[PDB]
Design an enzyme around this catalytic site. Structure first.
Site, PDB file in Angstrom:
ATOM      1  N   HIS A   1       0.877  -1.349   0.151  1.00 36.76           N
ATOM      2  CA  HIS A   1      -0.160  -0.090  -0.124  1.00 36.76           C
ATOM      3  C   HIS A   1       0.565   1.254  -0.088  1.00 36.76           C
ATOM      4  O   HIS A   1       0.878   2.592   0.835  1.00 36.76           O
ATOM      5  CB  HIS A   1      -1.041   0.230   1.478  1.00 36.76           C
ATOM      6  CG  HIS A   1      -2.104  -0.952   1.020  1.00 36.76           C
ATOM      7  ND1 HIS A   1      -2.533  -2.083   1.282  1.00 36.76           N
ATOM      8  CD2 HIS A   1      -3.235  -1.057   0.011  1.00 36.76           C
ATOM      9  CE1 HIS A   1      -3.621  -2.893   0.867  1.00 36.76           C
ATOM     10  NE2 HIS A   1      -4.300  -1.843   0.540  1.00 36.76           N
TER      11      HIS A   1
ATOM     12  N   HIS B   1       1.851   1.876  -5.707  1.00 34.83           N
ATOM     13  CA  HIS B   1       0.544   1.259  -5.849  1.00 34.83           C
ATOM     14  C   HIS B   1      -0.283   2.486  -6.002  1.00 34.83           C
ATOM     15  O   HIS B   1      -1.070   2.270  -7.177  1.00 34.83           O
ATOM     16  CB  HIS B   1       0.210   0.209  -4.397  1.00 34.83           C
ATOM     17  CG  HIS B   1      -1.843   0.503  -4.756  1.00 34.83           C
ATOM     18  ND1 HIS B   1      -1.973  -1.128  -5.197  1.00 34.83           N
ATOM     19  CD2 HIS B   1      -2.354   0.598  -4.082  1.00 34.83           C
ATOM     20  CE1 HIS B   1      -3.070  -0.590  -4.590  1.00 34.83           C
ATOM     21  NE2 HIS B   1      -3.220   0.486  -4.268  1.00 34.83           N
TER      22      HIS B   1
ATOM     23  N   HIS C   1      -5.738   7.755  -3.540  1.00 35.14           N
ATOM     24  CA  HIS C   1      -7.240   6.693  -2.880  1.00 35.14           C
ATOM     25  C   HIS C   1      -6.483   6.080  -1.412  1.00 35.14           C
ATOM     26  O   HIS C   1      -7.236   5.750  -1.068  1.00 35.14           O
ATOM     27  CB  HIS C   1      -7.751   5.736  -3.647  1.00 35.14           C
ATOM     28  CG  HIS C   1      -6.388   4.542  -3.732  1.00 35.14           C
ATOM     29  ND1 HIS C   1      -5.951   4.554  -5.079  1.00 35.14           N
ATOM     30  CD2 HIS C   1      -6.503   3.020  -3.448  1.00 35.14           C
ATOM     31  CE1 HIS C   1      -4.728   3.174  -4.780  1.00 35.14           C
ATOM     32  NE2 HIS C   1      -5.972   2.406  -4.830  1.00 35.14           N
ATOM     33  N   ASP C   2      -5.363   5.598  -1.103  1.00 40.15           N
ATOM     34  CA  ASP C   2      -4.592   4.639  -0.109  1.00 40.15           C
ATOM     35  C   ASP C   2      -3.655   6.156   0.548  1.00 40.15           C
ATOM     36  O   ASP C   2      -2.773   5.262   1.140  1.00 40.15           O
ATOM     37  CB  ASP C   2      -4.093   4.005  -0.723  1.00 40.15           C
ATOM     38  CG  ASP C   2      -4.863   2.749  -0.566  1.00 40.15           C
ATOM     39  OD1 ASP C   2      -5.620   2.317   0.252  1.00 40.15           O
ATOM     40  OD2 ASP C   2      -5.166   1.813  -1.349  1.00 40.15           O
TER      41      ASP C   2
ATOM     42  N   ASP D   1      -7.471  -0.770  -8.380  1.00 44.78           N
ATOM     43  CA  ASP D   1      -7.297  -0.678  -7.797  1.00 44.78           C
ATOM     44  C   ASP D   1      -7.091  -2.155  -7.220  1.00 44.78           C
ATOM     45  O   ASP D   1      -6.029  -2.175  -6.581  1.00 44.78           O
ATOM     46  CB  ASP D   1      -8.342  -1.128  -6.136  1.00 44.78           C
ATOM     47  CG  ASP D   1      -7.275  -0.490  -5.011  1.00 44.78           C
ATOM     48  OD1 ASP D   1      -6.203   0.158  -5.117  1.00 44.78           O
ATOM     49  OD2 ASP D   1      -8.142  -0.750  -4.145  1.00 44.78           O
TER      50      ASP D   1
ATOM     51  N   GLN E   1      -5.594 -17.824  -3.137  1.00 42.61           N
ATOM     52  CA  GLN E   1      -5.379 -16.765  -4.651  1.00 42.61           C
ATOM     53  C   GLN E   1      -7.004 -17.449  -5.538  1.00 42.61           C
ATOM     54  O   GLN E   1      -7.598 -16.361  -6.027  1.00 42.61           O
ATOM     55  CB  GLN E   1      -4.104 -16.799  -5.195  1.00 42.61           C
ATOM     56  CG  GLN E   1      -3.071 -16.256  -4.236  1.00 42.61           C
ATOM     57  CD  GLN E   1      -3.881 -14.584  -3.948  1.00 42.61           C
ATOM     58  OE1 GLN E   1      -3.844 -14.296  -5.832  1.00 42.61           O
ATOM     59  NE2 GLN E   1      -4.239 -14.196  -3.193  1.00 42.61           N
TER      60      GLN E   1
HETATM   61  C1  LIG Z   1     -11.602 -10.928   0.906  1.00 45.54           C
HETATM   62  N1  LIG Z   1     -11.203 -12.112   0.153  1.00 45.54           N
HETATM   63  C2  LIG Z   1      -9.338 -11.128   0.475  1.00 45.54           C
HETATM   64  O1  LIG Z   1      -9.376 -10.656   0.301  1.00 45.54           O
HETATM   65  C3  LIG Z   1      -8.409 -12.169   0.075  1.00 45.54           C
HETATM   66  C4  LIG Z   1      -7.098 -11.943  -0.847  1.00 45.54           C
HETATM   67  N2  LIG Z   1      -6.314 -10.615  -1.352  1.00 45.54           N
HETATM   68  C5  LIG Z   1      -5.797 -10.512  -1.822  1.00 45.54           C
HETATM   69  O2  LIG Z   1      -5.585 -11.817  -2.693  1.00 45.54           O
HETATM   70  C6  LIG Z   1      -5.790  -9.647  -1.948  1.00 45.54           C
HETATM   71  N3  LIG Z   1      -6.644  -7.950  -1.800  1.00 45.54           N
HETATM   72  C7  LIG Z   1      -6.994  -6.906  -2.514  1.00 45.54           C
HETATM   73  C8  LIG Z   1      -7.330  -5.802  -2.050  1.00 45.54           C
HETATM   74  C9  LIG Z   1      -8.913  -6.150  -0.726  1.00 45.54           C
HETATM   75  C10 LIG Z   1      -8.012  -7.194   0.908  1.00 45.54           C
HETATM   76  O3  LIG Z   1      -6.694  -5.728   0.454  1.00 45.54           O
HETATM   77  C11 LIG Z   1      -6.460  -5.262  -0.337  1.00 45.54           C
HETATM   78  C12 LIG Z   1      -5.555  -6.586  -3.215  1.00 45.54           C
HETATM   79  N4  LIG Z   1      -5.398  -7.221  -3.627  1.00 45.54           N
HETATM   80  C13 LIG Z   1      -5.072  -8.504  -3.502  1.00 45.54           C
HETATM   81  N5  LIG Z   1      -4.386  -9.996  -4.101  1.00 45.54           N
HETATM   82  C14 LIG Z   1      -3.189  -9.709  -4.780  1.00 45.54           C
HETATM   83  C15 LIG Z   1      -2.681 -11.082  -6.135  1.00 45.54           C
HETATM   84  N6  LIG Z   1      -1.470 -10.883  -6.587  1.00 45.54           N
HETATM   85  C16 LIG Z   1      -1.357  -9.329  -6.560  1.00 45.54           C
HETATM   86  N7  LIG Z   1      -1.653  -8.328  -6.380  1.00 45.54           N
HETATM   87  C17 LIG Z   1      -2.640  -8.212  -5.697  1.00 45.54           C
HETATM   88  C18 LIG Z   1      -6.238 -13.243  -0.436  1.00 45.54           C
HETATM   89  N8  LIG Z   1      -7.635 -14.070   0.041  1.00 45.54           N
HETATM   90  N9  LIG Z   1      -9.098 -13.927   0.422  1.00 45.54           N
HETATM   91  C19 LIG Z   1      -9.344 -14.163   1.544  1.00 45.54           C
HETATM   92 MG   LIG Z   2      -7.382   1.026  -0.054  1.00 46.03          MG
HETATM   93 ZN   LIG Z   3      -5.577   0.740  -3.578  1.00 45.37          ZN
END
Ligand SMILES: CNC(=O)c1c(NC(=O)c2nc([C@H]3CCOC3)cnc2Nc2cncnc2)cnn1C
Ligand SMILES: [Mg+2]
Ligand SMILES: [Zn+2]
Length: 313
Positions: free
Chosen positions: A68, A72, A106-107, A217, A269
């Site tokens: 974050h 990003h 945004h962050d 995002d 994932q």
């Molecule tokens: C709702 N379920 C989830 O959020 C979630 C993951 N999330 C995530 O894995 C994940 N979450 C976010 C956002 C939302 C929460 O933090 C920022 C952004 N990119 C993500 N993954 C990501 C994967 N590879 C590259 N960049 C980002 C991993 N496993 N779960 C259950």
């Molecule tokens: Mg945010």
């Molecule tokens: Zn963000």
């Protein structure tokens, strides 16, 4: 006045593609943003003296956290750039101005912790803002930087244009609260299918713009596999730190945040692409057909996680 930003040939070409990676040279990211504003918006949108001062204050108020962070911010702005450039005539001048700045901002001042962790910790920000806690903070920080002497990049808008742009930015940043994404996408799903979706309806654009923001995002999942895989390590570095902090409050963290359950990441994932990302880019592609490359790149990355599980990597 006649002063363009010009990127090297490879960046001038690749920056136009959804999957473009802004690279490891931090000192180029400001110019890449200005380059995007100048082609999305025009060389007249912002006073360069003021834009440049806004960008560098915004960079200062992002923290050195694994995911974050300033990188990003710019990554998320570039995706919005690519959506706006592939949907030339569907967005107003104000919307083009507002949304690039929203994505950059945004962050602001993210600490690497979820809204849940702030509430369980009893952080002051959770008493000041009961829902979309970090996101109301991020919008706050944006308005603050705008009101630093010499930083009001919108000063040359009419009083009412000014109020519309700060309102576009506020809704855009609130919409990055993933807790609000699920219901926004559902409502947009029904509106598109039943045929009631109507972009002249302001409450409808708001929903569309909210979905664009979730899409931008999460856009780390729409890169080439090697970018996405290495970004996943940065995001899990934060999750695991939050899980460590949960355990210090005496709380078992959810699995996505427990560094003992690294084995379960490939499957976590899958659930994330299936429950969040694929649905997001599907509904977005239906509303804005030219954004289809984000859906294709997301499906490719799901397939790569499917391969990790099947032992093949
Ligand atoms: C709702 N379920 C989830 O959020 C979630 C993951 N999330 C995530 O894995 C994940 N979450 C976010 C956002 C939302 C929460 O933090 C920022 C952004 N990119 C993500 N993954 C990501 C994967 N590879 C590259 N960049 C980002 C991993 N496993 N779960 C259950
Ligand atoms: Mg945010
Ligand atoms: Zn963000």
């Amino acid at each position: 006045g006649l002063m363009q930003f010009t990127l090297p040939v490879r960046l001038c070409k690749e920056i136009e593609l959804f999957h473009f990676d802004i690279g490891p040279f931090e000192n180029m990211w400001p110019g890449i943003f200005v380059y995007m504003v100048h082609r999305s918006c025009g060389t007249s949108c912002f006073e360069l003296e003021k834009l440049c001062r806004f960008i560098m204050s915004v960079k200062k108020n992002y923290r050195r956290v694994p995911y974050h962070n300033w990188k990003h911010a710019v990554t998320v702005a570039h995706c919005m750039y690519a959506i706006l450039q592939n949907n030339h005539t569907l967005f107003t001048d104000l919307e083009r101005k507002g949304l690039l700045i929203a994505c950059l901002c945004h962050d602001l001042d993210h600490r690497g912790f979820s809204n849940s962790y702030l509430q369980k910790f009893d952080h002051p920000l959770a008493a000041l803002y009961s829902t979309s806690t970090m996101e109301q903070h991020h919008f706050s920080q944006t308005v603050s930087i705008l009101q630093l002497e010499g930083h009001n990049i919108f000063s040359t808008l009419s009083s009412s244009e000014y109020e519309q742009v700060l309102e576009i930015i506020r809704k855009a940043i609130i919409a990055t609260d993933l807790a609000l994404y699920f219901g926004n996408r559902k409502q947009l799903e029904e509106m598109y299918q039943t045929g009631s979706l109507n972009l002249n309806n302001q409450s409808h654009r708001d929903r569309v713009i909210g979905l664009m923001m979730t899409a931008c995002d999460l856009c780390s999942v729409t890169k080439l596999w090697p970018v996405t895989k290495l970004t996943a390590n940065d995001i899990y570095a934060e999750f695991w730190a939050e899980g460590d902090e949960m355990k210090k409050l005496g709380i078992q963290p959810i699995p996505m945040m427990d560094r003992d359950k690294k084995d379960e990441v490939p499957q976590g994932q899958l659930g994330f692409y299936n429950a969040v990302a694929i649905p997001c880019y599907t509904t977005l592609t239906q509303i804005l057909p030219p954004t289809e490359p984000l859906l294709k790149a997301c499906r490719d990355n799901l397939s790569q996680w499917e391969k990790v599980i099947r032992g093949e990597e």
